[PDB]
Amino acid sequence: LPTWSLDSNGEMRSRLSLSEVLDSGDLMKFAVDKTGCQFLEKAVKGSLTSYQKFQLFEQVIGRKDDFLKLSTNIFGNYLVQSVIGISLATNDDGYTKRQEKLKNFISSQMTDMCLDKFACRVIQSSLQNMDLSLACKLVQALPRDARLIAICVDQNANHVIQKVVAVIPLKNWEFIVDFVATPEHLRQICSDKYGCRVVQTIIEKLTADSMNVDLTSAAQNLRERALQRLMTSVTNRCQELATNEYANYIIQHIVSNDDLAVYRECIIEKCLMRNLLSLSQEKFASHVVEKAFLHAPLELLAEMMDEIFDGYIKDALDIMMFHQFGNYVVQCMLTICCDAVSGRRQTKEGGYDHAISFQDWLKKLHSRVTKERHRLSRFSSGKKMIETLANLRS
RNA sequence: CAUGUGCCAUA
């Protein structure tokens, strides 16, 4: 901090002015200093004359090098967002130029700023506050190669992609959907702790749910077409996704969402069916199996139940009943059946009552749990299944 | 086995 501004105690002189700092050529020293930056933030929220604004704009968002330096600064990035805000609230002559130049600064460094812990905040703030059409030009600056993968899986940049999805029209980021649907890209991105959230955020935005009812018919169709292209890639590789430590969260989201019923059903048929015993024994896939049971249409559910009770290859029911992960599936099956039988769960579909089927499945589980109660009583899951059945009796 | 998975990030 420049000596001219300081005390005999080395503290910023009370009554130091914003104009003083602006006139001194030393704004950059204050802006990267914890204390100076706090001063500057208070100063710029005040009432600024035309000239103070002129200098603020030119010094904070008008010089490329200093702009990037501040945007990638731990304290400075805050001044930059505040100054961008002021600049958008100021409809003076140079309103457009400034905003155009800001777009250009950012665009020329999109990747690095996206990946930067501090500059990614400048990016998110600009996407949200800039006029739509300038914001859309920022989006076009995103890389379309391996760097876009690195962005979607980055701890900082993933929030940029999520912000794009939240505030930018689909027409302008449609490329991202197809980039992600590229089979190899989908794999790398869904199997990542950040990537899997980004993909879910994209799916949610592409879902014809209650948050999309304001869309026009053109917009709904654009949304639907993209949804279909993404889902095609998702369902083609759902086996791989369903068993991954991260991607299983995506498969569960789809399976559990009524607004995506058709994809739920495709996924159940394409990768779960005929694999229930195997998948119910996996750490990650077991949770997807539980979802399937909870949300499957009754027709498929019946095939799922039959697969367990009379499936191929110390029977399947026994394996799952006592397995460390499988017991959570059997419990789910049981709860489903008890709920149905006590009317807590709907048993009718397509104009017909599937109650006798539930009745059959319950019967089977009761008879098995009755015969195995000595072993089941050794386990927490077993105790619970026994008790579920006892409070049914009531 | 009284049992089994994630991310939601800046002064």
Curated annotation (Swiss-Prot):
One of its GO terms (molecular function) is RNA binding. Changing Q281G: Slightly reduces binding to lst-1. The keyword RNA-binding applies. Keywords: Cytoplasm, Developmental protein, Differentiation, Repeat, RNA-binding, Sexual differentiation. Pumilio repeats lie at residues 20-58, 59-97, 104-140, 141-165, 178-217, 233-269, 271-306, 314-348. GO terms for biological process: cell differentiation; negative regulation of translation; post-transcriptional regulation of gene expression; sex differentiation. Interacts (via C-terminus) with gld-3 isoform A in an RNA-independent manner. Interacts with dlc-1, and is required for the localization of fbf-2 to P granules. Interacts (via RNA-binding domain) with lst-1, probably displaces bound auto-inhibitory C-terminal tail and alters its RNA-binding affinity. Fbf-1 and fbf-2 are >90% identical on both nucleotide and protein sequence level. Experimental approaches often do not distinguish between the two genes, which are collectively referred to as fbf and are considered to be functionally redundant. This is Fem-3 mRNA-binding factor 2. The lineage of its organism: Eukaryota, Metazoa, Ecdysozoa, Nematoda, Chromadorea. The gene is fbf-2. The chain holds residues 168 to 567 of 632 of the full protein.
